[PDB]
Design a protein around this nucleic acid. Structure first.
Ligand SMILES: [Mg+2]
Ligand SMILES: [Mg+2]
Ligand SMILES: [Mg+2]
Ligand SMILES: [Mg+2]
Ligand SMILES: [Mg+2]
Ligand SMILES: [Mg+2]
Ligand SMILES: [Mg+2]
Ligand SMILES: [Mg+2]
Ligand SMILES: [Mg+2]
Ligand SMILES: [Mg+2]
Ligand SMILES: [Mg+2]
Ligand SMILES: [Mg+2]
Ligand SMILES: [Mg+2]
Ligand SMILES: [Mg+2]
Ligand SMILES: [Mg+2]
Ligand SMILES: [Mg+2]
Ligand SMILES: [Mg+2]
Ligand SMILES: [Mg+2]
Ligand SMILES: [Mg+2]
Ligand SMILES: [Mg+2]
Ligand SMILES: [Mg+2]
Ligand SMILES: [Mg+2]
Ligand SMILES: [Mg+2]
Ligand SMILES: [Mg+2]
Ligand SMILES: [Mg+2]
Ligand SMILES: [Mg+2]
Lengths: 63, 62, 402, 153
RNA sequence: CACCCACUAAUAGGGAACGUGAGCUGGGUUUAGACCGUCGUGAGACAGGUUAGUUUUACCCUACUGAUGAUGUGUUGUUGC
RNA sequence: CCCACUGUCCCUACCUACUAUCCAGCGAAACCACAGCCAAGGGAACGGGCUUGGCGGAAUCAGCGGGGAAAGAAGACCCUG
RNA sequence: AGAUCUUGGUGGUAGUAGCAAAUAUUCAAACGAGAACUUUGAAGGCCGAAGUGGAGAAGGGUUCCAUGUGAACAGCAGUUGA
């Protein structure tokens, strides 16, 4: 439903900002049950939570 | 029906169209529109502008 | 205290109710004074502002710098399909003014004319005049009509005829025609009644109403500019840039006394869409329109005595925002109020044209037909193709057409 | 409870009442005057049309500054508006009255709004701030509503 | 106000709360800072000079400009005076 | 004062953004003897009311700033105590 | 009945002024009675390291965190919230 807590926990555990945290919209129900960092780690391992890749800034023009 | 004129671009200028420009030195020119007059006023060569008649006859187009 | 310098008043006090026209047509309000010695003739007409262009002609005004010289004069094209007369109104003179005496409508009213009677033609049952026209057939209604004509003949002082335009002939969206009372003059009451009675259910071409190189009056409603401030509505002086609460205003709207605002103080409000009457407009050319006797003829609209080019009055690409003109058109001199596709009323001059401005013969030498949807540079398709030669789409169309 | 204007026959009639309804009182009054005397189905479809801005209510008494809309010409009036909140509140009240009419076991196909009344509810205080550190009231104007329907057809 | 330049047929005189600041401006007068000269012992003054110095609110009534309407003709429309 | 510069101006126009405008919701404040058509008269010597006369037609909208000797301070100028 | 009276209540104004300082939001989905404002994803942007980031002092004092509610408040709303 409202996964701000889950987003915060994922951002803290993954040690990345909330921008890079990807939560699966399909398994919203499964995520909402996770209220502990251990459960967040389990979801990360299962693949429901993905650390999105860093936005590309290429220096090829600069080079 | 009066005298037909030729512009910087070489087009015919019908009466009631364009403008007539006379310099101080003693030459009088006429331009079909503000585009042709502006091109003349930057001293742009007619032969290098693709849609001018002069460029067309220089490059044997058509 | 007096104002330190004198200055003419901004704005006209002859147009003070500066408000939108309550009518869209533009009514006559003053017809030419009748005289029975003249032949029976109409006095006015309905036109539509097709657009504007310019012409080349030689002036034959002696003693001027422009004698035997060629000038360029802007003109206005007014498309005027022949009016269809459907009725007659007779008026009787009273000490209380003119009042309507008796009205007669013709049978077989045109479908477009009947639409004027309906605000919503779409859902109508189309019943208008359906019971009325049946009295043109039975003997009782016929006798009633004959008594009506006799009463008009023996009582009415002036009469008018109702003519309507032909919407199907115009390229506009609106299919609702325009009705009009046109006064008939030049003869006795019986004579004009007989002439109109002949002309019921008939078409009156514009050439039978107005003539060449004759100066007429133009009536219409101007371009509605919407709500406007004082600066544009009255052309008063702008305030200095240091002005606090507004520079496009009038600084003083009246002295302390008489403790009110005089009507003559310029104030913001509606601009344009004003019913105006313009006079002294010379008719340079009355067009003939499109014919097909064997093929379509378009030269008659734009070819002059010295051009001889098979081209129409329609400019390259048609008239801006208007369409294509195929029917009888009138080429006035100068500007005409109202936008494109705005209905206009043209009337014979109420005055006597004795000035050498008037009654001067008009001979066109060249009529511009360049495209006004931009800076047009070619008179005709033929000349444009001749100058530019073949083109890429031309080549590819020839390729598929072999 | 003591309804104003009790019906002539309190057997063919049903009652609905509301108190402290968080709606504008003047808008409610104009709406109630608009729907007065209507059949219940006609009133319901009319309020739904108000919601969709297809039918406008004539603002007759409290018309200060109210703009002009074309649909006002249905009435002999010029000013009109489409109060959404008033429409929803009257819809809830009307459905409550319909439920009461069902409970009295009289058919709801024959109901006409013979009586309706809007009265100002007690005002509630809110606070605002002005240019020189001044405080102005930010009062609310709720309203109490009562109505009486009646079987007639 | 005055005067001059120039043009013009002519550059007449005035009123409307010495018209018109919820229209403007603030150059002057007429606060508080400050200098000069004159006066006074002094604080300070000077229709003497100079400089710098906050110009608020209209959504109310009415007026005025426009815009819907509104009264009767049964309704409604067209054309008109 | 001069060179240049330019919408300060001749002489105004157009365009953009936000407002104002209308709708949804929410929603005050100043002010208010009563109310608000004018001319003349008299009058506390400049009336919305009174007399004389001109007249006068529900409800309202967007403007507007002529009037309400508009509002804002028991005049700071001057005089008396 | 007055005292620009005191206290308290209520009107016209008026559903009016107004809710315009800092470029910008859109689609889909979910919960939910109810979604412009809740949450997720996608997109477009912005802050552009002298930040709309990360942390401290003074000051505040539980606002911190979880769960729950839609009475009041967050000048619209809110299933959200200091
Ligand atoms: Mg200023
Ligand atoms: Mg053009
Ligand atoms: Mg108002
Ligand atoms: Mg407003
Ligand atoms: Mg504030
Ligand atoms: Mg403060
Ligand atoms: Mg004078
Ligand atoms: Mg004065
Ligand atoms: Mg003033
Ligand atoms: Mg002022
Ligand atoms: Mg000054
Ligand atoms: Mg000083
Ligand atoms: Mg001394
Ligand atoms: Mg300074
Ligand atoms: Mg008076
Ligand atoms: Mg005093
Ligand atoms: Mg005092
Ligand atoms: Mg008392
Ligand atoms: Mg007393
Ligand atoms: Mg008191
Ligand atoms: Mg507002
Ligand atoms: Mg705002
Ligand atoms: Mg950036
Ligand atoms: Mg920081
Ligand atoms: Mg918290
Ligand atoms: Mg709120």
């Amino acid at each position: 439903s409202m996964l701000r807590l889950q987003k915060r926990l994922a951002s803290s555990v993954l040690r990345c900002g909330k921008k890079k945290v990807w939560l699966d919209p399909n398994e919203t129900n499964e995520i909402a049950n996770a209220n502990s960092r251990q459960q967040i780690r389990k979801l990360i391992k299962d693949g429901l939570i993905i650390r999105k890749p860093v936005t590309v800034h290429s220096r090829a023009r600069c080079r | 029906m009066k005298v037909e004129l030729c512009s910087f671009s070489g087009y015919k200028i019908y009466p009631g169209h364009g403008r007539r420009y006379a310099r101080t030195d003693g030459k009088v020119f006429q331009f079909l529109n503000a585009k042709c007059e502006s091109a003349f006023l930057s001293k742009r060569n007619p032969r290098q502008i693709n849609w001018t008649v002069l460029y067309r006859r220089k490059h044997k187009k058509g | 205290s007096h104002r330190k310098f004198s200055a003419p008043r901004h704005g006209s006090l002859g147009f003070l109710p500066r408000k939108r026209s309550s009518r869209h047509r533009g009514k006559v309000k003053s017809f030419p004074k009748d005289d029975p010695s003249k032949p029976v003739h109409l006095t006015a007409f309905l036109g539509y502002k097709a657009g504007m262009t310019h012409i080349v002609r030689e002036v034959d005004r002696p003693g001027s710098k422009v004698n035997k010289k060629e000038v360029v004069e802007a003109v206005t094209i007014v498309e005027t399909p022949p009016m269809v007369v459907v009725g007659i109104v007779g008026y009787v003179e009273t000490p209380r003014g003119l009042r309507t005496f008796k009205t007669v409508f013709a049978e077989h009213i045109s479908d477009e004319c009947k639409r004027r009677f309906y605000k919503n033609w779409h859902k109508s049952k189309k019943k208008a005049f359906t019971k009325y026209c049946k009295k043109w057939q039975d003997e009782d209604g016929k006798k009633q009509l004959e008594k009506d004509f006799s009463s008009m003949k023996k009582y009415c002082q002036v009469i008018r005829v109702i003519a309507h335009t032909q919407m199907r002939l115009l390229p506009l969206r609106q299919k609702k025609a325009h009705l009009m009372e046109i006064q008939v003059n030049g003869g006795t009451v019986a004579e004009k009644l007989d002439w109109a009675r002949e002309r019921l259910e008939q078409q009156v071409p514009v050439n039978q109403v107005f003539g060449q190189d004759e100066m007429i009056d133009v009536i219409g409603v101007t371009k509605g500019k919407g709500y406007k401030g004082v600066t544009s509505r009255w052309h008063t002086k702008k305030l200095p840039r240091k002005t606090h609460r507004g520079l496009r205003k009038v600084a003083c709207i009246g002295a302390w006394h008489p403790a009110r605002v005089a009507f003559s103080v310029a104030r913001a409000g509606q601009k344009g869409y004003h019913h105006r009457t313009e006079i002294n407009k010379k008719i340079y050319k009355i067009g003939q329109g499109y014919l097909i006797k064997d093929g379509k003829l378009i030269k008659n609209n734009a070819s002059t005595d010295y051009d001889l080019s098979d081209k129409s009055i329609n400019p390259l690409g048609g008239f801006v925002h208007y369409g294509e003109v195929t029917n009888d058109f009138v080429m006035l001199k100068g500007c005409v109020v109202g936008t494109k596709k705005r209905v206009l009323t043209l009337r014979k001059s109420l005055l006597v044209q004795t000035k050498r401005r008037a009654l001067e013969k008009i001979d066109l030498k060249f009529i511009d037909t360049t495209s006004k949807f931009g800076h047009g540079r070619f008179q005709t398709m033929e000349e444009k193709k001749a100058f530019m030669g073949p083109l890429k789409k031309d080549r590819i169309a020839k390729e598929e057409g072999a | 409870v003591r309804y104003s204007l009790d019906p002539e026959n309190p057997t063919k009639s049903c009652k609905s009442r509301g108190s402290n309804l968080r709606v504008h009182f003047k808008n409610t009054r104009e709406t109630a005057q608009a729907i007065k005397g209507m059949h219940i189905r006609k009133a319901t479809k009319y309020l739904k049309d108000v919601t969709l801005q297809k039918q406008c209510v004539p603002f007759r008494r409290y018309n200060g500054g109210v703009g002009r809309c074309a649909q006002a010409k249905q009435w002999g009036w010029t000013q009109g508006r489409w109060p959404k909140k008033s429409a929803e509140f009257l819809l809830h009240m009307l459905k409550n009255a319909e439920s009461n009419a069902e409970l009295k076991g009289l058919d709801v196909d024959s109901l006409v709004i013979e009586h309706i009344q809007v009265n100002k509810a007690p005002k509630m205080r809110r606070r605002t701030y002005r240019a020189h550190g001044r405080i102005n009231p930010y009062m609310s104007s709720p309203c109490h509503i009562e109505m009486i329907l009646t079987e007639k057809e």
